[PDB]
Amino acid sequence: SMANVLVLKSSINGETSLTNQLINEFLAARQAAGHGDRLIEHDLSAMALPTLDRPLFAALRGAVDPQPAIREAVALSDQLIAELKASDLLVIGAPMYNLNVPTDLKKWFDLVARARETFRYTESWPQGLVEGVRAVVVSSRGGIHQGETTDAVTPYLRAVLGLMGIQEVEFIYAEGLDNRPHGRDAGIASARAQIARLAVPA
């Protein structure tokens, strides 16, 4: 009855990382609420994920490319698509970096959002092929953006996950960390309160 949780960490701050700190605190809170978790942990920061270019996009679509480096990336694309389809809970660390997600997290979506694999084109809108997967997004920010137009990370993550079928996303925000005194403490405290709510639905 153990949950299958795929953990994607994309911060570059190493040990100092807050989205990764809040991911761990969120994981323990799930255990502290009676959940046995099976974790596949991917530090996207240190995996050197490949970038999507014209040759790689064709092998991901079908074309024969007997390049050792391109054959290896399609293998990585398949394993990542396999892990995501096999899990119950996708937990994404998405700190705001220059008003976008971190590049390595974007590279993951580039290798995981694939036609015939995670979605398929319908006469109307693409249909997702990932079934029964929840998404919880940790996202610490410098200033505060949730609600306003300058927040691009939030509507981005919703659209790209929904394209693949994950129409269940829940955000743990930690905005306002640039204000040295209260700002950091309040945003973290708000996230830790959001954590305690989200660590219950199992």
Ligand X SMILES: Cc1cc2nc3c(=O)[nH]c(=O)nc-3n(C[C@H](O)[C@H](O)[C@H](O)COP(=O)(O)O)c2cc1C
Q: Select the binding partner of residue 149 from ligand 05G, ligand X, its own copies, none (C-beta < 5 to 8 A, by kind).
A: its own copies
Do residues 111 and 76 touch, judged by C-beta distance below 8 A? Answer: yes
Does the annotation list 129 as a binding residue?
A: no
Do residues 130 and 87 touch, judged by C-beta distance below 8 A? Answer: no
- From the list 140, 132, 123, the residue with the least C-alpha distance to 191 is 140
- From the list 17, 2, 33, the residue with the least C-alpha distance to 197 is 33
Q: Select the binding partner of residue 115 from ligand X, its own copies, ligand 05G, none (C-beta < 5 to 8 A, by kind).
A: ligand 05G
**Considering the rule CB under 6 A, would residue 57 count as an interface residue with ligand X?**
yes
**Considering the rule CB under 6 A, would residue 164 count as an interface residue with ligand 05G?**
no
Query: Among 6, 7, 8, 17, which residue sits at the site for ligand X (rule: CB under 6 A)?
Result: 17
**Per-residue contact string for residues 42-61; x = within reach of its own copies by CB under 8 A:** ---x-----xxxx--x----
In angstroms, the Cα distances linking 63 to 54, 71, 143 are 11, 11, 44
**Considering the rule CB under 8 A, would residue 149 count as an interface residue with its own copies?**
yes
Nearer to ligand X, 4 or 192 (CB): 192
Site for its own copies in 17-46 (CB under 8 A): 45
In this structure, how many other beta carbons lie within 10 angstroms of the beta carbon of residue 4?
A: 15
CA–CA dist 33, 174 (Å, integer): 22
- Judged by the rule CB under 6 A, the positions of this chain that interact with ligand X are 11, 13, 17-20, 52, 57, 95-99, 140-143, 145, 177
